[PDB]
């Protein structure tokens, strides 16, 4: 059985370190909070979890999560409204995610909840490091490694469940849109139909390191991520991808690829279907989306916003996609860009207190 | 640039552990290797107690899996010397992951006699009973203490080592089972299959368990529509049989991005083209190609090769819910039997030859 809240240990530091101004800018990242969260598993079960003074990991040299890459990670935002409440976006969807993380790495179960509360005393210790400037707020980054000293490619009979804390300037800085060029190379793959590219597992991202690189070398920003004979849009970097057009039949529409294995189910992704669906005003879908039917749209005039949605931005406009040595320019900005300022202003009061919502969980 | 092995530092243990049944990769000898890489360039490399490692929680190398490893053998003789098979290709391999994933580059030669003067502290673990062998991990990870997806500009190579017992105990070869589900993708052409990269491992795990469970004891990996085989579980594929064509061949798969280019995998097709007694071929198989071999007893053996076991005999492979007969063992199996004493005849030193590198 799992960790429980209810078995807490607390050790508050003594050595607490200074907090980022605001007035100075931040690479994302590099600096995190007072506290940690440390919960260790073996094969009787869990221990009591933690929360101690951001340390310092001891590993042997042999953990399988250093050479079989069981590792895997969440990524959620803490936001610190004006009334001084901090509040999670969503963070039952991260969990659920999280959950389906471990089996697929054959990693240990965990309660949810217990998680997702111990997670909130975590926040709620270092809630003087949520900043509540425009734009801003706290990422939480969970992690869950094996951890058996053995070269066997096995089942860990060891683990390590943690959790650290980053506060985060704005993604975007002056607080407006910038929209990013795309590399769309299909010789790059970040995912196959089989894989695990469904999953946040550490394995799907040291691979795009070098990609994204060639992406810049070519003068691009993002590397557009193409899957199967057809050359369907999968993914923009770490963004889910979304296209907002008039369809072939003539019908506006919003489509995002379907969840069928290639794409990582982002939560901000689950909350533009929840919120566009939820308007009403438009049809909105999960479909497959080709280079083609891109090329097609974009040269009858048919496309009027293309983004990526995620975490680290909410959402992303796209001004130019470098396909097949031939630049695409998408006039995204030239649109408004309407959506995109839609969903960015109602994710905002939501996220920051300004309306209640039920998608929000108060720390 | 690169750490140099002239700069060695050697810090002997204090606390030796009591040497050794073994189960691989549990037991550890005394001594480790550590290099470290910052803005500096590579620090000196030394040779201290086996010890645990301290990272920082955001350390690159367990967020975005910016680790690598590699895997070759040490020998002992009957002259009680240390060997090693072939580890400059090794080397090779190591920095060619290396630069996949941004990782910093070293000299090969530098890193290989680091390795030497490890091996040769830790010699007294190398085992020297039928079969048996000291294997050695060396390891590069990031170790960036950032949250960025970005190319580190900190890393770490360390290497440990490991007494191994006999793969196959008493000597007698046997054979494994396999199940071949085209469900399951091991790698993919633009992927990153062809580098030993952690993150080809951590997801086979689940896959194995499957295997087990339908009865059989490693993974047929095939890749496409037409199903081409291209590894057994962690072994490169080999199938020894007479070809459409009429021509008694040895074949396995091309490194065409989906194939972990192994060293023994090479060795064997270096041996089998010396030996000049029948064609050696570098060629897609599929399972059409198979089960029609097999209909009409074209199929002499069908093996996995690899550092874990030299050659590995297949006499089974569940497909489509259908058990495949391989008549491997029935036929000697001649050809991996040879295989496998030259191999054993020259790693412990009955033969010389260059592929031996002398600790
Ligand atoms: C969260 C984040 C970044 C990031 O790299 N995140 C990330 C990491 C691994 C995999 C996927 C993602 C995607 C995701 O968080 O949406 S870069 C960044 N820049 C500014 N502000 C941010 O909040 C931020
Ligand atoms: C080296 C080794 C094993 C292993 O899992 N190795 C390995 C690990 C990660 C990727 C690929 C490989 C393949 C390879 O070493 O040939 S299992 C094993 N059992 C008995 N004796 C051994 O020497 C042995
Ligand atoms: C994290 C991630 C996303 C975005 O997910 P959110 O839950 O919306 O932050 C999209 N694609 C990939 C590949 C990711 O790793
Ligand atoms: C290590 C490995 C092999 C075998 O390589 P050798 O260098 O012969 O030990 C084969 N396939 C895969 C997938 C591997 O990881
Ligand atoms: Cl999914
Ligand atoms: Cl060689
Ligand atoms: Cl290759
Ligand atoms: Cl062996």
Redesign the interface.
């Given at each position: 059985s799992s960790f429980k809240a209810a078995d807490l240990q607390l050790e508050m530091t003594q050595k607490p370190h200074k907090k980022p101004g605001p007035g100075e800018p931040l690479?994302?990242?590099?600096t995190?909070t007072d506290h940690?969260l440390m919960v260790e598993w073996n094969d009787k079960g869990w221990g009591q979890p933690r929360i101690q003074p951001?340390?310092?990991?001891?590993?042997?040299?042999?953990?399988?999560?250093?050479?079989?890459?069981?590792?895997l990670?969440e990524g959620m935002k803490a936001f610190k409204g004006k009334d001084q409440q901090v509040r999670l976006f969503r963070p039952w969807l991260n969990m659920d995610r999280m959950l389906r993380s471990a089996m697929?790495?054959?990693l240990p179960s965990f309660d949810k909840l217990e998680l997702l509360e111990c997670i909130r005393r975590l926040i709620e210790v270092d809630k003087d490091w949520v900043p509540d400037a425009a734009g801003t707020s706290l990422?939480v980054?969970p992690?869950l490694?094996?951890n058996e000293?053995?070269?066997?490619?096995?089942?860990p009979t060891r683990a390590l469940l943690?959790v650290?804390l980053?506060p985060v300037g704005a993604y975007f800085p002056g607080g407006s849109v910038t929209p990013v060029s795309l590399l769309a190379d299909?010789?790059?793959?970040r995912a196959?139909?089989?894989?695990?590219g469904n999953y946040k597992?550490?394995?799907?991202?040291?691979?795009?390191?070098?990609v994204?690189?060639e992406a810049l070398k070519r003068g691009c920003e993002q590397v557009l991520w193409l899957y199967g004979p057809d050359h369907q849009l999968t993914e923009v970097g770490?963004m889910n991808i979304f296209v907002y057009w008039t369809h072939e039949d003539g019908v506006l529409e919003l489509v995002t690829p379907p969840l069928n294995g290639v794409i990582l189910p982002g939560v901000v992704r689950q909350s533009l279907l929840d919120m566009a669906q939820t308007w009403g005003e438009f049809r909105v879908v999960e479909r497959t989306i080709t280079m083609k039917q891109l090329l097609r749209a974009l040269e009858e005039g048919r496309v009027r916003e293309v983004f990526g949605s995620g975490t680290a931005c909410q959402v992303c406009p796209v001004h130019r996609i470098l396909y097949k040595d031939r630049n695409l320019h998408i006039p995204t900005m030239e649109n408004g860009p309407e959506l995109i300022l839609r969903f960015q202003k109602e994710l905002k009061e939501i996220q920051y207190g300004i309306r209640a919502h039920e998608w929000m969980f108060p720390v």
């Open positions: 690479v994302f990242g590099k995190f940690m951001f340390q310092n990991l001891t590993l042997h040299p042999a953990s399988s999560s250093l050479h079989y890459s069981l590792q990670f697929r790495l054959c990422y980054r992690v490694i094996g000293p053995s070269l066997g490619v096995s089942q943690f650290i980053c299909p010789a790059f793959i196959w139909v089989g894989g695990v597992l550490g394995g799907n991202y040291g691979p795009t390191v070098l994204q690189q770490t």
